[model samples]
Target: SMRSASEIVQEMGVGWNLGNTLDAKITNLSYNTSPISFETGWGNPVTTKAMIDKIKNAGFKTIRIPTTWGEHLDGNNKLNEEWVKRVKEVVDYCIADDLYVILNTHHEGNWVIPTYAKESSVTPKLKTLWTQISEAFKDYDDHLIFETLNQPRLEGTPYEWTGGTSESRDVVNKYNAAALESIRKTGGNNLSRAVMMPTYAASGSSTTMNDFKVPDDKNVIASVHAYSPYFFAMDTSSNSVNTWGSSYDKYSLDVELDSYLNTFKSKGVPVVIGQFGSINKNNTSSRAELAEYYVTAAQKRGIPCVWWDNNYAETNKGETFGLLNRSTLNWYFSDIKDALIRGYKNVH
Candidate 1:
């Protein structure tokens, strides 16, 4: 049952993010964060195995449920049995449908300090958190992947985007190493399980990626995020700029992947565009082309991109990239959906 990074990455093809559901928000307004409330809080309906089965039958080869681990525990900083069971239930559903699952600690910026100043406070929690996560799913096969952290970033600092001070990067590196070592001790396939771990803030910046040190492990696959050309894909000022088929945009996508591929893929380490997508501004045709070019660029670089579809309403302020309707089991923008599968339609 030995699976190498290449074989797994190749199989990933194209995937979908169970976003805003498990990875929904938890701030001053609400805190009790049960599995259902946390998921439906973001406006997504309660998820079911029927929904996942529909997606699997629809064409997606993987399902990445980004859960906020901070909620799956009680006040004593121990893993709450009920919440853990709830997560296992979802993961089990995916496994039963023969889908690849990527489980990770998401939206931890609220509770876990991702900075050097509080490295002492954060690393221990992260270590213990992953210890429980690793032990919980240790028996799963290579079909399941454990990501170290989802966009781990320092709060209220220039580091969030610009790649914080050297000290912050140092803290992140230490934490990453600690996570890999912590997970390896679980004794099952944990030792060889591939993790799509990332660097400072999971940034695609040259500074962040350069400072990234891929740990000395065979199964540690590098990870990055590239929702390239933020203006076209992310800006909310005007939706007319939605048409994205310019030479500049094309070059931008290629250049971004080239840098990451050179840094990781070129070095024999596999990579995954752990999160990438264009907001659904209702421009189906344009978005489809954009998706096509985006996936093709990453594909040429030996990376698979899992689209980030929170299914947030189009009225929302920032990047509202809801594609597949979990309740209806259909894409709000079916044109974009077809474009997404263009590259992932590879023959095995």
Candidate 2:
């Protein structure tokens, strides 16, 4: 467990997200009786070890399990033991494959706000939430990591996705520090366990990246999410283009990634692209190239990128980023999956 943050990241060749299943935002609590039912509420099947075996066999070195604990927490803010137990069941599957796992609080935006007014209430809630989580896996080694929050921001505000106000940024810092403090207080491998903290909304914009304050812990790493070449990767507007594989396109992405990644690299703090993917735009070949270019670029900088797979493949209803089909254990976009692995090992 003496590995440095950078060393741990480097060892993580490439990563995938256990997306919509655990992190699914529930709107109607009608059929939330069973935890398995809640997991399948988002259309992803109950996670199975064989499904994870497919991912490990395909060559990913790490997996990020995004869990939403807001709706599952009791009135006293304590995590539901059954829900946490289910999460650990999935995590143990990944560990069995020798994959580094990143367990994070996701889709808790309903309550985890970054504002002075909510700071006092939210910070303590985060502390309690993490204290239970840290204690649950306290003895686990460095293979397991705790991410403070997933894209914490002020929802319903104009600046929700954009860089938030300076006051909000300050609150984000406090929330992050409080989570780390709580985790460290549990006193186990968490004492040196690497924790990842995200920028406001996990934005890669200049203001947010520049304003992000790294916690005073040696094991802390910066976290940011980027769907680079936005028009092709995430945007669904009519003006968005769907072509890639140009020299200009690659250079544009490199410059954009370096702009923010360097901020941490320069300071000796390792960074991770916690969530990123090119949505299913009916342009599979182009997406494959973008994945290769993006991962290769990030790898060149010693940063690892995790592909965000929400388990929704069709673009009919909206922009979908699914890569593998959970139920059938088939990869919808094997080309992109292959590109991610190939790119990570690509040496410039």
Candidate 3:
């Protein structure tokens, strides 16, 4: 948002996703009661100024704030005033730090369930969300990016992550088109602000990514996620991942990054690895190695990564992406954090 999309992304080499916090949702739970209440819905402590300061102080220049307005939304299809104010309060924290911030629709597809990829189901809701969302941060400069959806799906579909059918892709395109139009019409800095759209499930696989078509606007960015070499990055049940060696198998991930560069970045679309990361799995060292290589690989192509951290911050045996604990504002594994930052500096 600050400069050319590529320049902005290149400089934002490493970013952290503020996950499972504001984006957390639970239906019929007296939510929408308040903005802070929603942020703490997932058990994360209510956000504080110190929390964000500690993150920036610890070393993070970009922050991805995933918020779910759907749950806090009124039955009349409008976001609560206090909730919006609370979100902007957090966004202000990032902008104050000069951190490039990405704020987007997060769990509604899974929690508050919308029309998803269905045109009729999504158009009005997305239109409402972005209209209000874009208006909220419209005056802000490029530092505030508005991503349309987080792993958007058709909700209750087998093809959600199966490389959606052509018709489904068309519906996704329509939703994106609608969201973009809403923002552009809002005027202010949003007119030129970069709007990132994720592919179905934001999957980095060619089968799904190849189908994403950017809106016909110069201020657009491609968003996709891939935890490559899946058996190592995601599968805790898989063996041979306790330690990653130099030759551990890079074909799949390498190809994914290569494909992204060739098809999108090389063609003038700035791609953001909107979310990708490995869990602890009692293999922090191997995870660190993978993070370094993967981040470096994507950085070389001018694509930046925002590690998908659910804010676990520590391991327990459940889904652990706990790299930095926002509640306490500390790194669970400093080496992994360093490896990610270092990856940006290393060309290879």
Candidate 4:
């Protein structure tokens, strides 16, 4: 038997993301390439089972693997066999570790455009992609969940981050419906497997939440990303705020989390913060503080968060959200990691 999205998510506890590895895309290449080259193109080493073991030992109950499929698709839109198998190998590693896996289509917005003009052209490709993906993992149990899209939005447009136009939002609804239908058709664990549906750009804006619609399935989760109190969590400017424990900080963060909980979870739609993190600003203590409060706030609302760790820990690197040093198999900031676990435990 399968469980509802809310019931499954409550057991997820805390989650960490395997970011920038499989999701890496290279645009300047001349021709087709090997799958290992694609996996490490972004400076992350080839994923090993031990990497997942480290993450599991660190107290994370779930791992979100973000994979970009656009580069690996052939002229006929079929996924590269090598690429598909490589992804499956990594997914199996997570399964062996007993961690809930969220496999998703990331960075595919290059072609999966959210517009009435592109809806007919893109929905079939999405369905085809999911059909292949679902078939590949159709035998897996509910421990594996499929996320339809990473962030469905009109990139480079004025409304890119602001939830987009009503027409664009409607197209996202179509995308969700098509992908869900495709997965269900694959028939197996997928029939009842939880699928994560994202809002436009995964933004928490009121307009986005108000316009967003879930697929006609009971086992679906609403996914959103909020690097709360933006200046502290995401902004990399010299004048950006670094500290995050102020009364104002909690208030601002609460406003966003409360909105997600009230809009989705209150209505029995499980919500997951698929991506959220504070960038390194030479303020490890502040980051640890943010991690504790952010996870606590969301967990209290029955929403689990997956920290976005792009694997860039050095202060000089751009937008450093690295939690685990993949090479050393250790956390860059163990305090923040501990804070996340504490946050989850605090709610329990």
Candidate 5:
């Protein structure tokens, strides 16, 4: 049986970035490119066992595998069996570790947007895509959670898209519902599997209950990514700090929390802040403060939040957002973990 939203939250734990590893692997196979890959290897192994061990040792109970299966799947929606086997291997590792897993299409938007989101004629193609993906995981148990989309884009460049506004959000819901129906029709464990619906622009504060298309199942949970002060979290340029200066402390953490919480509260819907974390590459002091503040606020509201650290612990180069030091293999922020545990415990 599918676990209720509340039950999932009660069993909620931390999360780690499976990174663009799956996407990289599929991309290589699709292009018949060289075996040596750069995108997936980032000072760590991208295998499922490595990820499972790292996450479990860190005390996290959930693993969110961001994948891009579209590259390996044929235009007719037939997935490469080898790719399917590889992904299943990782998922099995998570389940064996007794961890809940959230699987979703990632970076696949590169093709999905231009084909499905922008072109009306591609609806059937999109349907076929979901049908194949749904069938692939139809036999998986409730420990596996699926998300319809990840950060759908509708604007920016020919390649860069945006789906953060209210109007675009409606389109997002349509796509999600279509995907859900595809899964439901498969008739297996997926009949009751809980699926996550991501909000427009992946913003928690901007996502409203009305943004969803109302799935036929009650096991649906609303999902949104929290990356406030984005300029700092993902800034890759020198000038990016201007928007997130060191002294710009006008934003209150509580208000940010309330704004996002209200979206779920108003609809009586459970929310999973699927991604939230500070980038160590920015400023250590600021990152620490933001991390402490964000986790505390989410816990106070009884919301389950997951931290988005790719390999910050191993890459302490101010570019990675890991919590452990790669050199010493010791925690860099023990206090942050303590705070999260305490806050969650008190809220429960």
Candidate 6:
């Protein structure tokens, strides 16, 4: 039976991102020129039993394993066998511990989403990418959820990428259909595994509600990323800038949270706030307040929210956003953890 969104929430508990920890340490490379180093030297083969245990110990019932598989796939669209084996090893650990795991195409969407745009010339490559991804995970069972794309957007272009825009919304629907068909053709449990497709620009509220297509399968859910006050979340050196903190005062908490949840409820779809967290290097108090407010709002609407972390808060003393302290492996902000666990537990 398809689980209710609330049931999934009760089982998954609070979630966290196993960010570049594995990619940086195992892939031996970096995503962009940003000062962020992809090399954590954390463990070999990326995902390890120890890492899974750490997340499990943190009281997370779900672990989102975001992978940049493009760097590892062969020219024929087949994922590197070694990499696949390594990823599965970690996934097995998660399942053994009874945690739901979400695996998806991460940075590759920079190329895939744009190609789905009406004017994109790279349309041919888009199909190839999904076909390869489908083949890679087609055998995984229900415990593994597939997300079609992560943070889809035209990063460098001036294209209007929000869900409210006509072109952006249209492209998202078309891309989702294509991704589903590709997976369905691969056979096995993927035909039924709950697949999450993101909205244009990956915005929860901006996503075009009418553009959503009900998959022939019943387990589909709408997913979005919430990184408001982008400058505040992305900028590490600018402590003086307080975009998110300042805006919170202007917007009514009820309105802000309702706007997000209502957007999905109105469409009669299950919603996942796949990504939401304050950046590191900011005022801890302000971030904690934001966390409390956001979680409270999501709980009110029965929406599940996940935290994003790179596991760097421990070792990379300079980088911010690591919720867990590296040296102690304890939470950097115990209050945030308490609020999230308590909020979900209170949901009836």
> Best-fitting candidate, measured by lDDT?
4
Model 6 agreement with the true structure over 119-169: per-residue lDDT tens digits: 354344555666776676677656677777776666666764444456556
Per-model TM-score on C-alpha atoms? 0.93, 0.96, 0.92, 0.97, 0.80, 0.79
Residue 33, model 6: Cα distance from true site in angstroms: 20
Local accuracy of candidate 3 as per-residue lDDT tens digits, 1-348: 346565677677678888888888767655358677677878787877787776677566688999887776677778888889999999998889888999998887754232433456657777888899988887897788888887876667778667777776666666777888998889878788888887777777776677787777887888888776766676667352555646535565677788887878654688898888887777878888888888888887778888887877455354678787665567788889888888876952
Off by over 4 Å in 6: 1-10, 22-46, 113-139, 160-165, 207-216, 228-253, 314-319, 326-328
Show where candidate 5 strays beyond 4 Å: 25-44, 48-50, 114-122, 158-167, 205-210, 236-251, 312-319, 324-348
Tens-digit lDDT track for model 2 on 170-221? 8888899999999999996889999998989998888988888877788888
| Clash count for each candidate, listed in order shown | 0, 0, 1, 0, 10, 3
- Predicted structure 3: lDDT: 0.77
TM-score of 3: 0.92
**Positional deviation of residue 64's Cα in model 6 after best superposition, in angstroms:** 0.8
lDDT per model, in order?
0.79, 0.86, 0.77, 0.88, 0.63, 0.63
Off by over 4 Å in 3: 30-32, 110-118, 237-240, 313-316
* TM-score between model 1 and native: 0.93
lDDT of 5 by residue, 208-228 (tens): 434655566767777878665
Residue 251 lDDT, candidate 5, scale 0-100: 53
Native RMSD of candidate 1 (Å): 2.2
Relative to the true structure, candidate 6 reaches a TM of: 0.79
Better structure of 2 and 6 per lDDT: 2
Candidate 3: clashing pairs of residues: 313-322
Measured on C-alpha atoms, candidate 4 has an lDDT of 0.88
| Per-residue C-alpha lDDT of model 1 across residues 148-250, encoded as one tens digit per residue | 9888778777667777778777777787888888898787789888887887888888888877777788888777777767776787785436678889878
